[PDB]
Design a protein around this ligand. Structure first.
Ligand SMILES: O=C1NC(=O)NC(C(=O)O)N1
Ligand SMILES: O=C1NC(=O)NC(C(=O)O)N1
Ligand SMILES: O=C1NC(=O)NC(C(=O)O)N1
Ligand SMILES: O=C1NC(=O)NC(C(=O)O)N1
Lengths: 295, 295, 295, 295
């Protein structure tokens, strides 16, 4: 037997950083959860009990805090690239670092119509994430994403004209509720190294904002023919707006809300045009994915 | 042996209702999770296998959907009072109904700076709840609450002057991070029945809004001496603003964010006035409660 | 406004303790999650910012670890009584301590048909809990429980003869699946103090074992007429077997498994006597409770 | 823009099946959660709103129940292969089916030392899973796994001799607690089709049992030099025992239990050889992976 692949590191490292503007007294907080996994010439730690090649996972944890102390933690694409580059430069035998960062929302509170200098609210569980793979001699590959964005539209979703055979009971519809949790990922062109990532810093937050805006507007305005059709429209637009993105991937559940026939009770009408009360279904759910790239 | 107490019913009943304004085309959605438990002359179902006295839990589920079809579901205090009153009036042997409702946020989306007519976003996991106990001959007792409101302030929290003895290691501080998930409950004066609850309908949403506003403003502006002191200030204010509330209860965790001493590494300064990077602690957490009433 | 009630302390304190038999080399581990909340003459910490009366929650955390180091942590009823008594004896102004302990399973592994001396497995998420309220001048009240015991029987559950009216659609049945998560609590006679709790030490583990055994056997062997009827039989038996218990409370969900009519597809028969494939329902669920005491 | 990849289907489909032996009266239950995603010539559903090529996700849900009614659901490797093969044979334009099955434990109860004919207990949250990819013209690739197996050993784990540099604070140790949740996956040789999968049916349950047994025994008996070294020993053994497995992958967290220095309190000794009480850490955690194949 032989080691075909191996990676190891520290997961679930929670990190908070505050920035204090001495001029204005305004404070800004950042909170993330980080995972770093390393690869390299470490097979002997598995096969021969040779710990000499192992940077202890505790040390990886320390390195993340030290790196956050000495560098900006935003945009996360930059922080992740700095953190991953550190390992491959510092340790001769480590050849790849895989950094995953989940950014948690701490949105400044507005009190009396004015932004508060040091108070924040967690407005939803939506995350902004990055995955950064730093591989010696192969540059830096960054996948940015938003996830946990839960939306619902109560009309302007249709689903008819699908294949009907002996396994089909679903009735065609011209008006249904559509609700989903959006997971959208945009993969950047490969970067040659940290200098190149730094040169594009401003594009990261701007592209995240565009991705979010396009997702929301398209969902709200599309008279959806299917989840498939609506998600493709979102992906098309993001690619058109940022040339440095190579592909856009969406993964969307179709969280069903079923009509409830109440006609058995005093002829109450609650279906079709008269539907008012519905039963949200926790499971099962449709799951629709697609990856869109350039012609 | 004897039955000392018994209640039974249906939990986790998810309900969605849409309201469609034919004039404007604007749609508004409501989504809740409801639990109804009944009490009454039902002991024989437990002791003698006498199902004749049991309204099946499946029937309770049906009743919730039928009630939501025929009545307004907002404010939840009213819907809960209607639903609980139904059981005690309909069934001679049922003498109390306990209704708990959790309201989920579906906030209208703004697209291009304008409110969309039928698209919504789940902005955070904060809930608005009610507990309504309808007891034959004893009126309607309603406890309203908000929960899952997660906030953080990065300065203007202190904690010094506490008791120090041989179990104490905590250092006094004049500047710490304070973060908590707010659970606040306001208990209304007992109502004589549905007519009285209807007469106060407008106060329910208004009191929820006030409770939320006071909580946020007080948290943001108080130079907190302890969690105890800050929560009492919130409760005082809510009682002063709504005479029909008898008591206000707060339950607040103190979610710790620890300094990280990095001085072992090249003398890096990250404590006290130089603290920038902190380690959020998932557990343990302080838990502070209080119930405030009128003198 | 005035403080009507107040309690505060530390929650989610995870504690592990190992016992090492030097003779045999056998090691035994215990892992729990503890919460301690105190009450007493502490109102001024809320109303006047007087921290002098506050034992910091950090100190409560320290006390739990110190107490576990100096005393046995099993049975949890004893540990909880020792921990709660400590606070009311140590601090003159603290008059009640409320201790909740959740015990996690670490079951010794059997390797090659022999018990291993120091290796353990978490066999299910079932917990053994205690709630201990130590109140100055009023002794020690202990509620012991098991929770998270999930079972299913595939036949020998019936439900017919219930009330039928215009809200009823449920068909009577003489053969259904019954599945539930058992939460069972037995409340002990009030104890005068620690000496009395110590005198009954052996009864705690034995009563937990009996409660579990009776629950499982009754569930398995009863040709259930309803969840109500089956749970009463369990409670009756536990009360008959331990005179020092005053009441037994059960809270049971009825987790539904629905038949699936497949007759639309090539006349497939999957209902009634031919039912083989069912759809487990995540929600809603029945919730049935009862508290049984002595005549 | 173009569609680079696309797959869609139904997730979280809960399925229960009971087998009733008419001879013995013994009943056996199976409960799983299934996900099926399809790929094929479906791009136009995304790009042109052409639903004619879409088998609705609701129909996929129906197909799973119909398939479970007509075929054995165990071993899951067989059921998954049958289910995936159905889609590629039935629909000319569907060229790959991806089936993921999570099997939930329902272990027969022993009542009075005898196995009960129709009562079951969920003994832990450990799962047995399969991932089956059926691709037209490329056979059937099956990855089998166990996950959620949580274990702890209180001694006989060491960690010393690792790399020490300016980022290192971890002290070397010759005696620490090791606790992890085991995720182990064995990938079978590619099968040419359903006939070949059927020919190896008996090997599936046997290989799962061996994988579990080897994992537990190795964890219990290895005087572990690191998580890396111990996991490699497990993987080596599984490969040696089943020739039809090509690779074995393990992913193990290192869930830390920290010593608590109590010497500040009356010189209490709770570290090193005197450590009895430890603080389990919820996060961060080490995460160690490896994939082992044949020389
Ligand atoms: O493939 C599908 N796409 C959708 O938008 N809806 C469904 C459905 O099953 O309802 N299925
Ligand atoms: O009782 C307490 N109140 C607080 O506000 N903080 C603490 C603490 O332990 O930090 N304890
Ligand atoms: O009260 C009830 N008891 C039961 O055992 N079953 C039901 C039911 O609704 O199925 N309801
Ligand atoms: O790589 C590592 N392997 C281990 O077994 N332990 C550690 C550790 O950080 O404790 N790190």
């Amino acid at each position: 037997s032989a080691v075909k692949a191996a990676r190891y590191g520290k997961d679930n490292v929670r990190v908070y950083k505050v920035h204090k503007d001495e001029k204005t007294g305004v404070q800004t907080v950042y909170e993330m959860t980080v995972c770093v996994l390393l690869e390299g010439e470490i097979e002997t730690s598995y096969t021969k009990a040779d710990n000499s090649v192992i940077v202890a996972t505790d040390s990886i944890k320390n390195t993340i805090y030290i790196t956050a102390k000495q560098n900006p933690v935003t945009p996360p694409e930059l922080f992740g690239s700095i953190l991953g580059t550190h390992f491959i430069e510092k340790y001769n035998h480590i050849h790849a670092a895989h950094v995953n960062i989940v950014c948690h929302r701490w949105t400044r509170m507005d009190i009396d119509g004015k932004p508060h200098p040091h108070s924040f609210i967690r407005d939803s569980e939506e995350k902004r994430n990055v995955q950064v793979d730093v591989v010696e001699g192969k540059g830096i590959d960054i996948k940015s994403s938003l996830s946990g964005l839960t939306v619902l539209k109560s009309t302007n979703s249709q689903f008819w004209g699908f294949l009907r055979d002996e396994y089909t009971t679903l009735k065609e519809t011209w008006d249904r509720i559509l609700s989903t949790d959006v997971d959208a990922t945009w993969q950047w062109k490969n970067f040659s190294g940290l200098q190149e990532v730094r040169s594009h810093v401003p594009k990261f937050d701007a592209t995240w904002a565009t991705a979010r805006e396009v997702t929301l507007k398209t969902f709200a305005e599309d008279n959806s023919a299917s989840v498939q059709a609506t998600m493709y429209k979102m992906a098309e637009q993001i690619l058109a707006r940022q040339q440095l993105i190579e592909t856009v991937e969406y993964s969307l559940p179709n969280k069903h809300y079923f009509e409830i026939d109440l006609s058995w009770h005093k002829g109450l009408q609650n279906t079709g045009k008269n539907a008012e009360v519905f039963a949200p279904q926790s499971d099962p759910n449709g799951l629709i994915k697609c990856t869109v790239g350039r012609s």
